[PDB]
Design a protein around this ligand. Structure first.
Ligand SMILES: N#Cc1cc(Cl)cc(-c2cc(-c3ccc(F)cn3)ncn2)c1
Ligand SMILES: CCCCCCCC/C=C\CCCCCCCC(=O)O
Ligand SMILES: CCCCCCCC/C=C\CCCCCCCC(=O)O
Ligand SMILES: CCCCCCCC/C=C\CCCCCCCC(=O)O
Ligand SMILES: CCCCCCCC/C=C\CCCCCCCC(=O)O
Length: 408
């Protein structure tokens, strides 16, 4: 009994249980909330099946401490390894498919704007110079400012990843373009006259604004004071009429007509320009971890060595640890890539922060656990902390919005 050790002078096993109990309660609360309000846009706009898998993994996480703190039975040694191994694999491998999907969607977004300016501004598959004599390639992508033609080729090879000999492809030109877009977005957000407009527009209309920036510069776009106010107040027709009067429309009519049309409709008309699959992939990544766990059951049969000490060796811990490490690594990779994505009330900003801490917690875990003389309790807290972070940073903010902000 955990109370006995508490009265003998050891408050560790009673603390881990209470932690786990509060964890299960919090996960039970959050889960019921999503069941009731499944039709509310904050829950509907995200993958709901994946969340249930993430919530289940967190639940099993807290249940682990009941297997590390238990009566000495044989199957509890089995439940430990199955629990400490599969629980992270259920949450993280479901989260990676979610982040990967967010990464592909974002990549396809950068694909559209790339095609937009390929049509409006043009493209060169070999090295040239701008109006100021600096070496340039693709859609106006500056390579270097040295007169050396060799200097531009060296910078190009570092950016592409091969020996290009001054010649690239459309895809490789898009690679360089993605940088220039991100650089342009930075400037807009650091511009007081362009930032409020950019924040209000949808995905398509933001590309149109960037298009204007790539033609006239930030100082130039800020000149459209009235038209920018119209776009911000979502008065598209008036903005269009207003923009058709500018010197910009009259100096470059063909291109300006396409940019304006994009503002009007919010579509790509002026330019020629799976849920089930996610569950299967998530299921596959979880089965791989199970295969590792089952194989280690055969190689090294679990056996009993309040505290329940099992004969689980280092390899029995390291192998499922490393695989979970890969899942976490892939999650953080795509999460960082989509950190600024504002979908679902900036949902992606919360996922990135979780993976930042998760990486730290799991990295710090290795020297702490393997260097500990209190492994069971250290495992209990590590698991619950890992499960608490994913629960507190990803779900609690959405639960708060759904209960406190019914008008948002
Ligand atoms: N060896 C080892 C090891 C080390 C650490 Cl630091 C955490 C865990 C862990 C994490 C989760 C878990 C489950 C859901 C979630 F969202 C986060 N973590 N469940 C069980 N064990 C295992
Ligand atoms: C809300 C608070 C609920 C959280 C925990 C309360 C239950 C704690 C159970 C510990 C009992 C251990 C024992 O019976 O030996
Ligand atoms: C109410 C909460 C109850 C928690 C009860 C579980 C505590 C004891 C389980 C671990 C053990 O076997 O010692
Ligand atoms: C959760 C249950 C999922 C898997 C449990 C299967 C474990 C069986 C592996 C065989 C163990 C052994 O050979 O000793
Ligand atoms: C940031 C992603 C998550 C963190 C990565 C996970 C770390 C697991 C990978 C390798 C751990 C190193 C191998 C274990 C060291 C064995 C120590 C020992 O038994 O003496």
């Amino acid at each position: 009994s955990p109370v006995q050790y508490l009265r003998w002078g050891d408050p560790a096993p009673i603390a881990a249980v209470v932690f786990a109990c509060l964890g299960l309660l919090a996960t039970l609360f959050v889960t019921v909330v999503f069941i009731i309000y499944r039709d509310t846009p904050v829950v509907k706009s995200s993958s709901r099946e994946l969340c249930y898998i993430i919530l289940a993994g967190i639940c099993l996480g807290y249940l682990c401490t009941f297997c590390l703190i238990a009566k000495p039975k044989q199957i509890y040694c089995y439940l430990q390894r199955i629990g400490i191994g599969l629980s992270p694999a259920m949450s993280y491998s479901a989260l990676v498919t979610k982040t990967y999907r967010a990464a592909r969607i974002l990549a396809m977004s950068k694909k559209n704007i790339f095609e937009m300016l390929r049509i409006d501004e043009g493209l060169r598959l070999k090295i040239y110079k701008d109006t100021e004599g600096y070496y340039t390639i693709g859609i106006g992508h500056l390579l270097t400012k040295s007169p050396s033609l060799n200097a531009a080729k060296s910078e190009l090879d570092k950016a592409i990843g091969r020996n290009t000999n001054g010649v690239i492809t459309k895809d490789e030109a898009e690679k360089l373009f993605n940088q220039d877009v991100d650089a342009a977005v930075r400037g807009i957000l650091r511009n007081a006259k362009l930032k409020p407009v950019y924040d209000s527009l949808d995905a398509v209309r933001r590309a149109a604004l960037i298009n204007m920036v790539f033609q006239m510069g930030e100082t130039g776009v800020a000149g459209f004071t009235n038209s920018l106010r119209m776009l911000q107040q979502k008065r598209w027709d008036e903005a269009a009429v207003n923009l058709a009067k500018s010197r910009w429309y009259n100096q470059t009519p063909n291109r300006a007509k396409r940019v304006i049309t994009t503002f009007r409709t919010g579509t790509w008309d002026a330019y020629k320009i799976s849920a089930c699959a996610q569950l299967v992939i998530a299921f596959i990544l979880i089965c791989i971890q199970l295969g590792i766990i089952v194989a280690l059951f055969i190689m090294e049969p679990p056996d009993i060595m309040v505290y329940l000490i099992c004969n689980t060796t280092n390899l029995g811990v390291v192998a499922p640890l490393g695989y979970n490490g890969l899942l976490i690594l892939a999650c953080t990779f795509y999460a960082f890539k989509t950190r600024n994505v504002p979908a679902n009330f900036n949902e992606a900003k919360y996922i990135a922060f979780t993976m930042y801490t998760t990486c730290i917690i799991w990295l710090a875990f290795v020297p702490i656990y393997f260097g500990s003389n209190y492994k069971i309790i250290t495992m209990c807290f590590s698991v619950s902390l890992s499960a608490t972070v994913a629960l507190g940073c990803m779900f609690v903010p959405k639960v708060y919005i759904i209960l406190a902000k019914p008008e948002r």
